[PDB]
Amino acid sequence: GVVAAAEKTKQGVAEAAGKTKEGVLYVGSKTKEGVVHGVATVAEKTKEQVTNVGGAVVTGVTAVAQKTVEGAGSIAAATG
Amino acid sequence: GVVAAAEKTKQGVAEAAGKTKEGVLYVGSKTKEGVVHGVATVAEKTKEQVTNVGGAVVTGVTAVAQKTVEGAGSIAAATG
Amino acid sequence: GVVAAAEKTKQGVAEAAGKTKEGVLYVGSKTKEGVVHGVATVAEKTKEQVTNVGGAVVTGVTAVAQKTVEGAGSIAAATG
Amino acid sequence: GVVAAAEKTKQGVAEAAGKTKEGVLYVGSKTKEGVVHGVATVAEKTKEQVTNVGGAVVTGVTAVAQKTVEGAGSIAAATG
Amino acid sequence: GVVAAAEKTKQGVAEAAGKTKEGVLYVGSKTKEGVVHGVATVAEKTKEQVTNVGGAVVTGVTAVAQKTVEGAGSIAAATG
Amino acid sequence: GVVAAAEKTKQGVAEAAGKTKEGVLYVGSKTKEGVVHGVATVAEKTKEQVTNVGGAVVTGVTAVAQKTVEGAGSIAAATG
Amino acid sequence: GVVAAAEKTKQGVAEAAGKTKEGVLYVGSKTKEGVVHGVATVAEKTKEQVTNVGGAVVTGVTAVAQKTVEGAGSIAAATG
Amino acid sequence: GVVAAAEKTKQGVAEAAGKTKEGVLYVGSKTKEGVVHGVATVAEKTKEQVTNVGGAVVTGVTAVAQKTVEGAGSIAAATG
Amino acid sequence: GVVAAAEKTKQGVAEAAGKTKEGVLYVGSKTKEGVVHGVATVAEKTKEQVTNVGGAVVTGVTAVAQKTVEGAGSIAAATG
Amino acid sequence: KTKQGVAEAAGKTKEGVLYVGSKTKEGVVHGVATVAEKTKEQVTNVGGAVVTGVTAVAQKTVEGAGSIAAATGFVKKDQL
Amino acid sequence: KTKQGVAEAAGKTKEGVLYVGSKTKEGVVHGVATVAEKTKEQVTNVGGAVVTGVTAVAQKTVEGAGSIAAATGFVKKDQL
Amino acid sequence: KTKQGVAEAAGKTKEGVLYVGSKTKEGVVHGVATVAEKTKEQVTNVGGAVVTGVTAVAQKTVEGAGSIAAATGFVKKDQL
Amino acid sequence: KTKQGVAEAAGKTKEGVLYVGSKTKEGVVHGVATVAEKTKEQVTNVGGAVVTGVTAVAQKTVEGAGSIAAATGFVKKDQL
Amino acid sequence: KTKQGVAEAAGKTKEGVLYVGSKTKEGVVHGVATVAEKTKEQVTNVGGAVVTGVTAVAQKTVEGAGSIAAATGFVKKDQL
Amino acid sequence: KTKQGVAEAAGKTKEGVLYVGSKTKEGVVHGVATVAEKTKEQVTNVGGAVVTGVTAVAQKTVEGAGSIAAATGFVKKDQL
Amino acid sequence: KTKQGVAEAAGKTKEGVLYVGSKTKEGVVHGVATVAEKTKEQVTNVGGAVVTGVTAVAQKTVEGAGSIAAATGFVKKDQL
Amino acid sequence: KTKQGVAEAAGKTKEGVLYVGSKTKEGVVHGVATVAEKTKEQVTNVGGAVVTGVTAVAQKTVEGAGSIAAATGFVKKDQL
Amino acid sequence: KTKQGVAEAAGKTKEGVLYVGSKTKEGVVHGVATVAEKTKEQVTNVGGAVVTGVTAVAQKTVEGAGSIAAATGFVKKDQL
Fold first, then answer.
1. C-alpha–C-alpha distance, residues F47 and R23, integer Å
2. Residues P50, O49: contact at Cβ < 8 Å?
């Protein structure tokens, strides 16, 4: 039982609410989720080698922002 | 039982709400999910090699923003 | 039971709502999901080699923004 | 039971709503999903080689924005 | 049971709604899904080679915006 | 049961709606799905070679905006 | 049961609707699905070669906007 | 049961509708589906070669806007 | 059961509709489906060669707007 | 000498294709698109002006002191 | 000499493709798109001005002292 | 000499593709998009001005002392 | 000499692709997007000005002493 | 000499791709986006000015002594 | 000589890609986004000014002594 | 000589990619985002000024003695 | 000579990637974000000024003796 | 000579990546974020000034003797 009342008033406001659930709000904000910024490499000879024979390999520069709900959020998964 | 009332008022507002669920709102914000920004490479000889023989390989510069709901959110998956 | 009432008022507003669910709203915002920005490479000799023999390979510069619902959101999948 | 009422009012508004579900709305916003912006390469000799023998290979500059619902959202899939 | 009423009013509005589901709306917004913008390559000798023998290969500059519903949204698929 | 009523009013509007489902609407917006914009290549000798022997190959500059519903939305598919 | 009523009113409007489903509408908007814009190539010698022996090959500058409903939306398909 | 009524009104409108399904409408909009715009090539010697021996090859500058309903929407199909 | 009524009115309109399905309408809009616009080539020697031996080849500048309903919408098909 | 509102162009070439264009727009109204769907309008006017339609007016004048382009919806009762 | 509102261009080439363009817009209204769907409007006017429509006016004047482009929706009762 | 509001361009090339463009906009209104959906408006005016529509006015004047572009929705009762 | 509001460009090349552009905007209104959904407005005016619509005005003037661009929604009762 | 509000650019190259651009904006209003959803407004005006809409005004003037861009929502009752 | 508000750029290259840009903004309003959801406003005005909307004004003036950009919502009752 | 508010840039290269940019902002308002959700406002004004909306004003002036940008919400009753 | 408010840059390279940028901001308002949720405001004004909204003003002036940027919410009753 | 408010940069390299930047901010307001949630405000004003909103003002002046940036919420009753 929720009741609000206003009467005999020049400017009256009556506001009622049974159940309320506030939510997220960003005002003038900034965010950085999974960011790579400013990587420099000065070599003479570079060499990479990957010899995957049935798994999962993730190399190089990476930036991930997974947001899964009802499952594995792996980056490199390998099941058998 | 939710009740609001206004009467005998020059300017009256009555507002009622049983159940309310607020939601997300961005006002003047910025976001960065899965971003690669400013990568520099100054070499003389470069060499890459990938010899995948039945798996999953992900290389180079990468930027992912997966948002799955009811499944695996892998980047490199390898099942058998 | 949700009730709102206004009476004997010059300017009256009565507003009622049983159940309400607010939603997302962006006002003057910016977003960046899965972005690659500013990659520079100054070499003399470059060489890439991929010898996939039955899997999944993803190379080079990449920018993905998957939003799947009821399935795997892999980037490089390899099942057997 | 949702009721709104206005009476004996010069300017009256009565508004009722049983169930309401708000929706997404962008006002003056910008978005960037799966974007590659500003890639520069200054070499002398370049060489690429791909020798796929029955899988999936994705190379070069890529920008994807998959939005699948009831299926795998892979970029390079390889089943057998 | 949803009821709205206005009476004895110079300017009256009564509006009722059982169930309502709001929808997406863009007002003065911009979007970028799967975009490649500003790629420059200054070499002297370039060479590409692809020797696919029964799979799927996707190379070069790419920009995809798949929006499938009830099927795989791969970019390079290879089944057998 | 949805009811709206107006009476004894100089200007009255009564509007009722059982079930309503709003829809998408773009007002003064811009979109970019699957776009390649501003690619420059300054070489001296260029050479491409493709030797597909029974699969699917997609090369060069590409820009796709698939919107399938009940089928695979691949770019390069190869089944057997 | 949906009812709207107006009576004893100088200007009255009564509007009722059982079920309503709004639809898409673009007002003063612009779209770009599958677009290639501004590609420049300044070489001295160019050479392309394609030796397809029973698959599907798609090269050059491409811009596709497939919108299939009940079938594969591939760009290069190869079945056997 | 949908009912609207107006009576004892100088200007009355009664409008009823059982089921309604709105449709797409473009007002002052522009669209670009499958467009190639602004491709320039300044070489000295150019050479193309295609040696298809029983598949499908699509080269050169291309711009497609397929809208199939109950069939494959491939660009280069090759079945056997 | 859909009913509308007007009576005792100087200007009355009664309009009823059981089921309604709105349709597409373009007002002051422009469209571009499958368009090639502004291709320039400044070489000294050009040479093309096609040696199809039983498949389908499509080259040169192309602009297609297929709209099939119950069949494959390929550009280059090759069955056997 | 004096130049106002002048669009000028020039072009020289020895061999090749040439295009020169010069367009000028002064006092031009272009593209006024309007839709009214299922709209109710009720007007009662007594000795006044009511405007509800679409009015597109363009004017260009040289030596036009005291010019008026569009005077819409007004009541003028000057004594002198 | 004097230049106001001038768009000028020039171009020289010996061999190749050339494009020169010069456009000028002065006092131009472009692209006024408006939609009103299921809208109710009720106006009672007594000796005044009411404007509800769309008014797009463009004007260009040389030597236009005291110019007015659009005077919309006004009541003028000057004594002198 | 004097330059105001001037857009100027120039270009030289010996071999290749050339593009030169020069555009100028002065007193230009571009892109006014408006939607009103399920909106109720009720106006009672007695000897005044009410404006609710869309008014897009553009003006350019040379030697325009005392110029007015848009005077919308006003009541002028000057004695002299 | 004197330069105000001037956009100037230049470009030289011997071989290759060239682009030169120069744009100027002076007194320009671009992109005014507005939506009103399920909005109730009730106005009673007696000898005044009420403005609720959209007013986009752009003006450019040379030698414009005493210029006014947009005078919206006002009551002027000057004695002299 | 004198330079005010000038955007200038230059570029030289022997071989390769070149881009030169110069843009200027003076007195420009860009991107005014507004939404009002389920909003109630009630106004009673007696001899005054009420403004509730959207007013986007841009102005540029040379030699504009005493210029006014936008005078919105005011009551002027000067004696002299 | 004198430089005010000048954006200048220059660039030289022998071989490769070049980009030169110069932009200037003076008296510019960019990006005014506003939303009002489920908002109640009630105004009673008697001989005054009330402003509740959105007012975006931009102005640029040369030799503008005594300039005013935006005078919004005021009551002026000067004796002289 | 004299430099005020000048953005200048320069760049030299022999081989490779080059970018030169120069931007200037003077009297610029950028990004004013505002939201009002479920807000109640009640105003009673008698011969005064009330301001509740959004006012974004930008101004740039050369030789502007006595300039005013934004005078909002005021009551001026000067005797002389 | 004299330098005020100057942003200057320079860059030299023989081979590789180069970036040069120069930006200047003078009298600039950037990013004013505001939210009001479930807020009640009640104002009674009698011959005064009340300000509750958002006011973003930016100004730049050269030779501006006696300049005022923003005079908000004031009562001026000067005798002389 | 004289330098005030100057941002200067320089850079030299023979091979590799280079970045040069120079930014200047003078009289700049950046990032004013404000939230009011479930706030009650009640104001009664009689011949005064009340300010409750957000006021972001930025100003830059050269030769500005006697300049004022923001005069907010004041009562001025000077005799002379």
1. 43
2. yes
Residue type (1 letter), B62: T
**Are the C-beta atoms of E72 and F74 separated by less than 8 Å?**
yes
Q: What angle do CA E39, E41, E45 make, to 5 degrees?
A: 155
CA H40 – CA G38 distance, rounded (Å): 8
E64 has a chain P CB within 8 A of its CB: no
Pairing of strands M3-8, N3-8: parallel
- Measured in whole angstroms, the distance separating CA E36 from the mean position of its chain's CA atoms is 16
Q: How far apart are CA H12 and CA N29, in angstroms?
A: 43
* DSSP-assigned states of every residue in L12-72: B-SBS-EEEEEEEEEEEEEEEEEEEES-EEEEEEESSEEE-SEEEEEEEEES-TT-EEEEE
Q: Where on the phi/psi map is residue Q5: left (φ > 0), alpha (ψ -120 to 50), or beta?
A: left
**Which tokens belong to L3?**
């330059």
From the list N49, L74, J45, the residue with the least C-alpha distance to K47 is J45
Kindly state the DSSP code that residue E74 receives in the 8-state scheme: -
For residue H69, give the amino acid letter: V
| Residue M30 assigned ligand-binding role | yes
- Return the HEC string of J46-58: ECCEEECCEEEEE
| C-alpha distance from F56 to closest chain E C-alpha (Å) | 5
Q: Give DSSP secondary structure letters for H3-66.
A: EEEEES-SEEEEEEEEEEE---EEES-B--EEEEEEEEEE-SB----B--SSSEEE-SB--B--
Beta carbons of D34 and C63 less than 8 angstroms apart: yes
Please name the amino acid found at residue C62: T
CB atoms within 10 A of CB R76: 13
For residue R11, count other CB atoms closer than 10 A to its CB: 17
Contact C33 A68 (CB under 8 A): no
The tokens of O78 are what? 């000067």
Q: For residue F15, list chain L residues with Cβ-Cβ distance below 8 A.
A: 38, 40
- Contact status of E66 with chain C (Cβ, < 8 Å): no
Contact across the interface for O4 and Q45, Cβ inside 8 Å: no
Please list, in sequence order, all residues whose beta carbon lies within 8 angstroms of the beta carbon of residue N23, skipping any fewer than 6 positions away. Answer: M7, M22, M23, M24, M25, N7, O22, O23, O24
Q: How far is P54 from chain N (nearest CA, A)?
A: 10
Answer whether B50's CB lies under 8 Å from C52's CB.
yes
- Cβ–Cβ contacts within 10 Å for residue Q72, how many? 29
Q: In this structure, are residues B22 and C22 in contact, taking their beta carbons and an 8 Å threshold? A: yes
Question: Could you give the CA distance from residue G70 to residue F80 in angstroms, rounded to a whole number?
Answer: 21
How far is A14 from C4, CA to CA, in rounded Å?
A: 9
CA distance P17 to chain Q (A): 5
d(CA L36, CA L52): 11
- Segments of D1-80 assigned E as strands: 2-7, 11-21, 25-27, 33-42, 56-58, 76-78
Q: N15 CB contacts (<8 Å, ≥6 apart)? A: F42, G42, M13, M14, M15, M16, O14, O15
Go through chain A and list every residue after which a break occurs, taking a C to next N gap over 2.5 angstroms, comma-separated: none
Give the Cα separation of E36 and I52 in Å (integer).
34
Q: Is residue B79 within 8 angstroms of chain D, CB to CB?
A: no
CA geometry: angle P19, P23, P29, nearest 5 deg: 145
Q: Could you tell me which of C71, I77, G77 has the C-alpha nearest to residue E78?
A: G77
D75's torsion region: left (phi>0), alpha (psi -120 to 50) or beta?
Answer: alpha
* Helix H or strand E encompassing K60: strand K54-62
Q: How was this structure determined?
A: cryo-EM
- How many Cα atoms are found within 13 Å in the side-chain-facing hemisphere of O27? 31
Torsion sign (Cα): E9, E13, E17, E22: negative
Verify whether the Cβ–Cβ distance C27 to O35 is below 8 Å. Answer: yes
Q: Six-digit token pair at L58?
A: 């553009």
